[PDB]
Symmetry: C2
Subunit: 316 residues, 2 copies
């Protein structure tokens, strides 16, 4: 299901599908499929550049929410192996809006923590649209401590609309849990790398994003507040979300100059959704490179550097 501005790409795709049927549909129909396929694929490839060259911040947000995209499960599958999912906070529940586990990266063992919006409606409602109740963040703290204890690096993916705004979420110390998370992660003796795949932000995202390095795709928005919220509070409306997106600076290159993120991982054309494997390979390369130049530093120097980088936050 392509977005509104990806229409010319769609109709060309719509002609492309029935090519399979015409191959063996009925009445002996087996036409010269290869010629038409090649011409239509050429046109489609040419047109996507005609479509994805002129997208800006409001679009970037739409693309960051494309309802066909790799979630943390997808990146785990397409760049990680021997994945073991640990579920359980030890207190009140395991949460489906966060998925964590311990896996191997090119032999090396790692910890993977991140969100999972679910693909279709069913897995979206079963995972609460990637909105974690605090018990999830307590689980994430528990896993992060486990990873710290056994001299293990931590790889974290961040793809959350935000911490759930609900009765159950507020009752259980949402603020307290996120505060603790932000406290412990800033003392681990192991390197930390955190991407911004997909749509993330709204503070709750930061619960698992305080690390040595930070990386973001080219169509991923990292906003202290969703554009619609900023629009409602400030613009006194919702339709004016694109203006809020333009003003805030939620796009990766805008953030990059702000010394906030350490690298942008380029996407396959038309969005990572068109070539999830290519995006997974790019992410794996970026993660490995980040880990490499990180392992040289010792644990004490690692923590000191982490603290120093934090203090660089804010123009002050």
């Amino acid at each position: 299901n392509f977005l509104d501005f990806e229409q010319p790409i769609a109709e060309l795709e719509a002609k492309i599908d029935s090519l399979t049927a015409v191959s063996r549909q009925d009445e002996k129909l087996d036409i010269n499929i290869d010629e038409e396929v090649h011409r239509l694929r050429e046109k489609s490839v040419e047109l996507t550049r005609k479509i994805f060259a002129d997208l800006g911040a409001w679009q970037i947000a739409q693309l960051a929410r494309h309802p066909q995209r790799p979630y943390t499960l997808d990146y785990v599958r397409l760049a990680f192996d021997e994945f073991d999912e640990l579920a359980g906070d030890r207190a009140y529940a395991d949460d489906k809006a966060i998925v964590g586990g311990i896996a191997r990266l090119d032999g090396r063992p790692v910890m993977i923590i991140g969100h999972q919006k679910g693909r279709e409606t069913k897995e979206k409602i079963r995972r609460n649209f990637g909105m974690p109740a605090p018990e999830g963040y307590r689980k994430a703290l528990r896993l992060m401590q486990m990873a710290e204890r056994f001299k293990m690096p931590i790889i974290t993916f961040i793809d959350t609309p935000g911490a759930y705004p609900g009765v159950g979420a507020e009752e259980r110390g949402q603020s307290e849990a996120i505060a603790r998370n932000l406290r412990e992660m800033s003392r681990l003796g192991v390197p930390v790398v955190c991407t911004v795949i997909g749509e993330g932000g709204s503070g709750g995202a930061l619960a698992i994003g305080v690390g040595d390095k930070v990386n973001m795709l080219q169509y991923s928005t990292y906003s202290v507040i969703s554009p619609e919220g900023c629009a409602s509070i400030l613009w006194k409306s919702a339709d004016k979300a694109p203006l809020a997106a333009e003003a805030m600076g939620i796009i990766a290159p805008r953030l990059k100059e702000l010394k906030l993120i350490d690298s942008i991982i380029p996407e396959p054309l038309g969005g990572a959704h068109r070539n999830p494997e290519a995006m997974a390979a790019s992410l794996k390369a970026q993660l490995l490179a980040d880990l490499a130049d990180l392992d040289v530093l010792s644990t004490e120097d690692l923590k000191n550097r982490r603290y120093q980088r934090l203090m660089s936050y804010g123009y002050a």
Copy 2:
């Protein structure tokens, strides 16, 4: 237009035709034409043997009258070159039921006399269904004399239902003209070869068929009277034509044993009409072979042999 017993061959042909259309008809239709063409041609080739193995004398007559077949024009075109058509009896008209001319056979010059039924209805009525009025036979005598004079061999084809049974034909000495023809041809000083391509007989055919050699296709009937006439006079009916054909002995092999014809030229499968070129090549080879072993004999010995062979006619 195939005959009644060639139906299974037809329907398979009927499926075969629209293969051309399906190649580029509409809606991008270009199917794997070669596979279906090969399979259907295999089936058609197998079926014709299933159809032309079990034909007998009544059929042979039907095949001899297949309304798709090479007439003398066709054999001239497909086995002769530098053909010049002489038309004119010098007396009252040139006739379209006979076509004569002087042409070359592999360099050698020859004379070609024979009938031409015309292909479609128009050329059939314009040529009087290959039925010659006597002026035609006078023309044939004139040409035969011309060929004799200039030491030239004569090749004759014979494809006639018969001499026209009409007022104009009877008035002009039909009997006289044919008698003269039968007289002169038995004195020419040049070799004579005469086939029985197509349907011929009824005496008038003999007007141009008294030569050193005689040859007949495998599906050509040479009857002193059409089967239908024999049926009407003797059987007292018309439907009983096949019995008349069986009794008379109008089929080539039946005649061959009678010492009446000197050779049968085998046909392409399914009738010469399916491969007119192959039939033309076979006819040309037979004609050349006949001429070869004939030119050895001198003119006097040629005429003496011709006379002796004639006397062998009839068991007496």
